[PDB]
Structure formats: C-alpha cells, structure tokens
Amino acid sequence: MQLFGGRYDFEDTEVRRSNFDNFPQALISVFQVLTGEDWNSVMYNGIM
Amino acid sequence: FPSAVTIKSWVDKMQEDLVTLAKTASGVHQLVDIYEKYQDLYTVEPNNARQLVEIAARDIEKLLSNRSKALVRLALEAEKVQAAHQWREDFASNEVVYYNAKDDLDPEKNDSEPGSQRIKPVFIDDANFRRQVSYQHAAVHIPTDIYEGSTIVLNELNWTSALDDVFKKNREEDPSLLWQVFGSATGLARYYPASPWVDNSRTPNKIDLYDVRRRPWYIQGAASPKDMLILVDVSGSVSGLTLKLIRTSVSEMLETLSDDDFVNVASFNSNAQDVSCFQHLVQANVRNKKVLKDAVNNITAKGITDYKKGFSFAFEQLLNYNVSRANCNKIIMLFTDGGEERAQEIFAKYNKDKKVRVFTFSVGQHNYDRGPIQWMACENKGYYYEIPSIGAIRINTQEYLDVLGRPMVLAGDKAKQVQWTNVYLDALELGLVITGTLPVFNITGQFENKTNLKNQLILGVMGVDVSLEDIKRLTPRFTLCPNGYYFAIDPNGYVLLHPNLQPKPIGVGIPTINLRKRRPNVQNPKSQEPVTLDFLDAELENDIKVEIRNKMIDGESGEKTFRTLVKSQDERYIDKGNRTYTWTPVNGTDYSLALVLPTYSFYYIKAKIEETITQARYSETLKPDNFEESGYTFLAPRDYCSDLKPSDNNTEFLLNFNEFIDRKTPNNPSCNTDLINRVLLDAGFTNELVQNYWSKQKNIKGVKARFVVTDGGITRVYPKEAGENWQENPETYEDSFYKRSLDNDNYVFTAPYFNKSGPGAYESGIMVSKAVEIYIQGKLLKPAVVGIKIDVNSWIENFTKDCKRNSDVMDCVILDDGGFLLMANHDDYTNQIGRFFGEIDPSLMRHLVNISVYAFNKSYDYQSVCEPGAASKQSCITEQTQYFFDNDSKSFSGVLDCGNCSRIFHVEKLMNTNLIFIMVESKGTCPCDTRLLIQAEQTSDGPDPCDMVKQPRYRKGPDVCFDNNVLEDYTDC
Ligand SMILES: [Ca+2]
C-alpha cells in the first residue's frame, strides 16, 4: 500500500483488479502473489 | 539611365498603341451604336431598390409562415394522438409494422423481429430531393446502439404511426416541402418522405453515429439559451482513467452548445483557475469551442481538492454582467469523481434563492463517496449523472436538456413558437438548409391533473427543413448587374444568404493529422457543426459595413450609398467601386434582408421582341453548324423553362435549348418569357455585331480572339479555333473579368494564370476587356462587355521596337493593378508571364509597396481546403492578400538602396488602362534578395480569439426565456 498505493493511474481503459489501493484489496493482491498465480502480471503493473 | 521625358514618351506611344488596337479591333463603339440604333426592340425599366427588398422580404416571410403553419398542425396531432395511447407491453400477437431506414433493400430478407414487421417500399426517384423518396409512409431512424424492440421504443413506433397522415396532408397542401421530422426523446426520428439512410449500420464498412437528440435543431427547440460553466476537477484523485473520461466528456458536452449559449471552463484543485485565456463567459461559437477543447485536452491532475474554492469561483463567474451573456439559464456542471465535502455554506452564501442549477457528473470506476455529489445535484434544482466508460458519454452528456425543459413545459401554450436554426448541412445530403423547430408536450390526464410526473418533460421536437435554394428563388437576381445581389442576416451577425456562402463547413485553425496513429478500419467520426459565417467575414470590412450590420441587426430599415473596396471573383484583385445598400426587416421572423446595387445598375433592359419573324431570325443564330459564320456561342445555364435542366456540358445545353425553343411555339406557356426574350434579343445584337464588323477584317495583326460576353448568357468568340481556348464560365454572372470591367471606366488587362496546366501563355493570349456603355434617355447602362486576346509575340516585338531583349543594363516590365507580370524584357521573366512580380523581384516589390504605389489588403477565407500539416484534405482558414493602386499620381522616380549598393528605378502608369511600366537597374547589379513576397492563399489560423472576446462584435439575443417556474418538481437526481 506504500509502494504501489494509488500509483496505478494508467491512462487506458484496461482494467487492473489486483492493485494495492485499500487494505482489503492489498491483502487479496498479496495472497495471490503468495500462491504464485498470475504473480508475473502483478509485477508488470508495478514496474510500469 | 534614361531620363524621365524619354520614358514618358515611350509609355505614351505604348499606351496609345495598345488602346487603339483594343478599341478598333474589339468593336466597343460599334456595339454601342447598334445597342443605341434600335431602341424599339427593348425598353428601359427601373430597379426601385426599395420595392424589390420589400417584395423579397414579404415572399420570404410568407414562405416561412407557410412552413410554420405545417408545424403547429404536426405538433397538435402528435400531442392529441399520444394523449390517447394505452401503453401495451406485449407486442407479439399485435405486430408494429413500420419502415426502419438503414435496412437492406434486397427483397429477400423478411426480418420481422419480435414485435415488429418491416415494409419493402417502392422508392420512386425525385427532384427537390437528390435521392429516391417514397411518398407512401414515413421512415424511422433508430440510433445504432438502441435496440428496436424495447418496450420504450416499440411504443414510440406505435403512437407515432398516426403522424403519417398529417405528414401526407401537409405535403399535398404544399408540394414544395422538404423533410418533415419528428425527433423524439427516445432516440427515434420519424421523417417523411421515406428514404434510406445514408449510412447503414454495418451493411457497409462504416458506422453511423447520428443521434437526433444531439442535433442543432433538436437542442434548440428543446430548451432556452444557457450560461454554462463547466467546472472540471483536476485534483490528484482524478488522475488515471477518470481524467481521460473527464476530458472526453467535457468535449462531448461542449458539442451540445449553440451560438446563443455562453460557456467557460474553470478548473479547481485547492485553487480555482480558468482553463484557457478567457476568464469570463464567451459566446460558444466554433472558434471559442475549439479554444476551450484544445485547452481542456492539456489538463493535468495534481493537488488536493477544495470544493469551496471551485464553487466560489464558479458563482463569481456567473455574476459578471459586465459582458454579453444569454441571461437565461445559469447552470454549473461539476465534472468530478467523488468526495466528502458537500459545502452547504457556499450554496447558502451564493444561491440561497436557487437561481443557479447544478448538474454533477461522477466519472470513472472508483471507490469514493458520491453522497455529497448527489446532494449538491438535487439540492440546487440540478441533476446527477454517472459516466463509467466511453460508451455512456454520448448519452449522459446530453440528457440535461430534460431538466432545463421543465419550465418550458410548465409555461404551456406560451412556450410554443417556431424558431429557425443556423444554416447547416443536411444529414440526407440536401445541401445547406435551415430547420424550424417546435416542441411537443406530453399531456396525459390534462383535464383532471392526474400524474404531472412524466408530464414535466417534452416528448420530442417537430422540425421541417427549408433549403437555401428555396430562398434563393424568391430573390431573383437576373435584372441586376453581375455586381448587385441580395443577402440576409440573423440577429447574430451570421449570414443566411450571400454570394460567398458555400456548401462546405466552416474551418477553424490549421489542420494537423497524425497518419501514424490511425488503424485503417476504425471509422473516424466526421462533424456536426453548422455553417456559421459572419457577415463581416464574407465581404471586405469597412467601418461603414460595421455600421450597416449593427443597424440591420436590430430590425431597422434604411439605405446608404458609399464607396468601398470590392474583391473580384477570382481572389486576386480589388476595385474601388460605389455601392448602395438598402435594407429592411423580415417582419414575421428575426432576419433582415439587404440588397446591394451599384449605381449604373438602377436601370435594366426589358426585351420587347413581339414580331415573331424577328424572334425566329434571332433564334436561328445560335445553332452550332453555322458557328463559322457567327463564332463559338456559349449560353448561360439559367432555367428558362421547366423542362430542360442546366447541363454543365454547354454543347448539350445549347442543343437542348435550340430544340426546345423550336419544339414549342413562341407562345411560351410555361417558360420564363422575360429571360428567353432577353436572351434572344441579345443573341440578335451580338450576331449583328459579329457579321457586320468582325467578319470584314477576318484577321488583325495582334489580335488572337475577339469576344463578346453579355447579359443573357450570350458569349461569342469569333474564330472557332479560339472557341476551344475559352476557359471562362458560361454563366456571365460568374465571369470575373466581366464584373471587373463593369466597375472600371477604361480598359482592363487580366493577367493569365501561371504554372497551371492548360493553354495559358502563348496559345491563348492576354485578355483585354472594356464594358459597353450606352445612354438611352440620359440613363446609364452597361449591358455587354467586349474583349480581345492579344498575341504575346506581336506585343513583345512592338515592346522592343534603352530596353533590348536579354539586356543586362536594365530591366523593363509591365505590370497591372495586382502586381502580375504581363510583358517583360528578359526572356526568362517573359517565360513566366502571369506570375506575381513580388515572386521574381521581391526587393523592388517591397519597395513599391513602401513608396505607396501598391497598397494591399489582407483578409481571411474561412471555407478553404488544405492538405493537413505534420503534427484526404481538411477544411482550413486561408489568408488572402490583394494589391491595388491607391495614389492616382502617375510617375514615381527613385532608387532603392539594397545594402552597400543602390538601383535606380522609374515607374509610370499607362493612363486609360490599369497598366504600370517599370524600368529599373538590372537585378544582376545588386546581389541582394530579402525573401519572396508571395500573393497566394497562405494557410493560417488567426485571428486570435483570445483577443476578440475582449471586445466582441455586436449581437442581439432572444428575449423569450423560460427558466424558474415555481410549480416545478425537482425531486430527481
Ligand atoms: Ca498460472
């Protein structure tokens, strides 16, 4: 929530549900990187 | 360097030779004497320039009145028929049979969707429509992304089915009606006569985005003029996709504003500032809207939010009253995402009395609070909209005209007045039209006061088109010279009728395209703007025309004779001519009609040929096979009779015209007998001239073609071998040289074009013209123009016989008023005959402009076509320059010091023509050149509107204003 909190301000209509905006939505976005499922796309949003 | 006296004698002999050749070979005097020797085949009638304006104004008022009477009928029937509608919700067994336009015409589809049943029409072909129409039923247009079969749409298609008989009876009561349309608040548009839509949905590759609820006529007849103040939110939280949707939404919202509405775009993030260079409500015309859009597309998002600052700024912008406003609807549009401050303080401090509405748009997919925004919305009589994607923008940024229309409904029968739109281009390709609208009210249970919940909104708007070819027929312009004309005016400046209003859209700025960001199959949208061309932007602008304009905008009659610069047909010259503007108001409506007559045009010629033998004898002369005895004959494509139509292939037209005038007796039952009598009398006169004079000296030394262009379309070019070298228009009222040589009282040289593909330098020759001018009863007349094409070679050799061909001691050129090269002395100049002189000797030309021999005027053309820049064609503004003689003194001697050197020059104007002989030290002497002085349409973007709004043109506004009725509901948000 500090690193990528509110930084997903992309100017396209692509949807990104696994983001770190609030606590209930950062917990879900961390649990998914922990179960190693589609975690490589949560990294490309964090890098872009 | 030769002295002044020898040069004066040179130009004296040169001018004398030129003038005597033109006078003795064209035949001015002989045509004058034969125009004066008859005096019995015709009569001289006066143009009472006041009676004409009154008659034309009454004809226009009567036409618009007949179009009004066909609107209140439609609206009455629509209100009555919808009042008695029962709202069924099961349409399976009872099909709704109708003709959905933009459906396929192959007769083996048989769609018959659930609840609906189509029709296969017959589609005869028509005139007054450039397409195929069916007078049996009305067509329906349903926007692409609106399902046809929704119970809301199938109900409109039910109770609108009873409009078709009133459509039919209106049409058969007045067979010259164009489209009648009912455009309803559910997207539908039912128009008559039926005709397939121009863009089917996906049967072609392209999409149609036409929503009857965004059209100018609908948005006009659905509310009253506004004072909008779009208050964008550029806080940090709107960054991302919300900001993009806010930009697109503000643009699509501006596209719903007309020229009577005033608008400004603020922007707040812990500080409220304007978004552009304006700082107060501006008039929302095409240029101001372009400025606002280009400034909104640069918005960036960063900071904290503060609604109190933004609303203080908005409410303080809506209280200026130092500027011109619409003074009717004060609304604030807040484009935001979500917040927590509702700020009751500011709404109590500024609109405790609720004069300013608030519409709040919450944009994007976010997780913020919207309670405060809905509260602001439906606390201040406003409304609340949600815009989550690009697809909902077009539908949410147009639906506030349901809120703004409540007072117009609670006003009732007082609020039903027909009002006419700006000039715009028809959506079914009819050209330029104006549409008259009248709203339709929903009255269910009106004698017992039952619901009044759906009965606050209108149903739709009823409109009916009036083409501008319908108005240009009530102002017939063929008893005036090529120079006089009618023109009308809005109570806004904008022009409704003019000789300089073209069917193209009004251009803004400089066109820029990025070809490298457009997929080949994406179907870009095109345009929606009206053709709003101000009156001062169609002509040249004195400060006496500003006076006439501001005097006829407020419905005054009068007359004014003065002297003005007039720009020739081809935008290359300028003439100081006298004019007489006589104007009057059109009583029924808010237009004003003026007539421009040049003195020498207060009398015209009326044919009186009644001895049918003379008629037949004259009509014999315009037959192709005897051209070798009378010269190539062109005939202007005017509508003499109902049957034949202008052909654009003048041989086709001359053949049809001859076979017509002999195919029907001279009785003339259905023919415009005055036009035809004049044309035949004219042909007789011209043929007598050609036979008695041009036939005797079959060939002269310098002449190449001797022609006569007159009133009645008759154009005669003597050697048919020169008839193939006539690039002029056959309609003599569009011949640039004709209108030019009517103004001047002497000979006029028309410098040919340069580097344009065609026979233009040596095969054709240089054109010289003079206007025949006769006195019948002490009354001036200028009925014809006689001319000559001078051979370039004979002129060169008479020019040389100290100037020698390809000399290098000096240069000796001949230019005209306009600075175009005619006869040079260097064989490389002479190669480029017809080019602007400032393009082949820029230093001398700038100096000439400086020493005040050549004055110049600059203007803008707002409907031009250009190749887009880098940042098929687009529409563009082109600046046009035009040079002319200002000082009437002849000789000008001097010397230009072009830096460390100086070349001496002497210029002398050949009197009795428009020619100027220049003799200068050679250009090889001084190796100086600043830069070319181009006279051509240079694509520009000015004037800067950031400065025109500080001191705008005069304008009057509509005085009916329906806002703030106190029995409203406003329990909606
Ligand atoms: Ca996986």
Swiss-Prot record, chain A:
Processing after translation: Phosphorylated. Phosphorylation by PKA activates the calcium channel. Both the minor and major forms are phosphorylated in vitro by PKA.
Q: Tell me which positions the record assigns to the signal sequence.
A: none
**Position of motif Selectivity filter of repeat II?**
35-38
Q: Which top-rank group of organisms is this from?
A: Eukaryota
Q: Where in the cell is it found?
A: Cell membrane, Sarcolemma, T-tubule
Instruction: Give the residues the record marks as binding Ca(2+).
Output: 37
Q: Which residues lie on this side of the membrane: Extracellular?
A: 5-24
Sequence ranges marked intramembrane in UniProt: 25-46
The entry's note on the tissues where this protein occurs is: Detected in skeletal muscle T-tubules (at protein level).
Function field: Pore-forming, alpha-1S subunit of the voltage-gated calcium channel that gives rise to L-type calcium currents in skeletal muscle. Calcium channels containing the alpha-1S subunit play an important role in excitation-contraction coupling in skeletal muscle via their interaction with RYR1, which triggers Ca(2+) release from the sarcplasmic reticulum and ultimately results in muscle contraction. Long-lasting (L-type) calcium channels belong to the 'high-voltage activated' (HVA) group.
Provide the family line.
Answer: Belongs to the calcium channel alpha-1 subunit (TC 1.A.1.11) family. CACNA1S subfamily.
Quaternary structure note: Component of a calcium channel complex consisting of a pore-forming alpha subunit (CACNA1S) and the ancillary subunits CACNB1 or CACNB2, CACNG1 and CACNA2D1. The channel complex contains alpha, beta, gamma and delta subunits in a 1:1:1:1 ratio, i.e. it contains either CACNB1 or CACNB2. CACNA1S channel activity is modulated by the auxiliary subunits (CACNB1 or CACNB2, CACNG1 and CACNA2D1). Interacts with DYSF and JSRP1. Interacts with RYR1. Interacts with STAC, STAC2 and STAC3 (via their SH3 domains). Interaction with STAC3 promotes expression at the cell membrane.
The free-text domain note is: Each of the four internal repeats contains five hydrophobic transmembrane segments (S1, S2, S3, S5, S6) and one positively charged transmembrane segment (S4). S4 segments probably represent the voltage-sensor and are characterized by a series of positively charged amino acids at every third position. The loop between repeats II and III interacts with the ryanodine receptor, and is therefore important for calcium release from the endoplasmic reticulum necessary for muscle contraction.
Q: What is this protein called?
A: Voltage-dependent L-type calcium channel subunit alpha-1S
The record's gene field reads CACNA1S
Tell me the part of the parent protein that is shown. Answer: 578 to 625 of 1873
Curated annotation (Swiss-Prot), chain B:
Disulfide topology: 378-961
Species of provenance: Oryctolagus cuniculus
Domain Cache: where? 420-511
Provide the organism lineage as a comma list. Answer: Eukaryota, Metazoa, Chordata, Craniata, Vertebrata
Report the residues modified as Phosphoserine.
93
Q: Where is this motif: MIDAS-like motif?
A: 233-237
Binding residue positions for a divalent metal cation: 233, 235, 237
List all annotated glycosylation positions: 66, 110, 158, 298, 322, 587, 755, 850
Q: What membrane topology does this protein have? A: Single-pass type I membrane protein
Q: Explain the purpose of this protein.
A: The alpha-2/delta subunit of voltage-dependent calcium channels regulates calcium current density and activation/inactivation kinetics of the calcium channel. Plays an important role in excitation-contraction coupling.
Tell me the name of the encoding gene: CACNA2D1
Modifications the protein undergoes after translation, according to the UniProt entry: Proteolytically processed into subunits alpha-2-1 and delta-1 that are disulfide-linked.
Record's protein name: Voltage-dependent calcium channel subunit alpha-2/delta-1
As recorded in UniProt, coiled-coil segments are: none
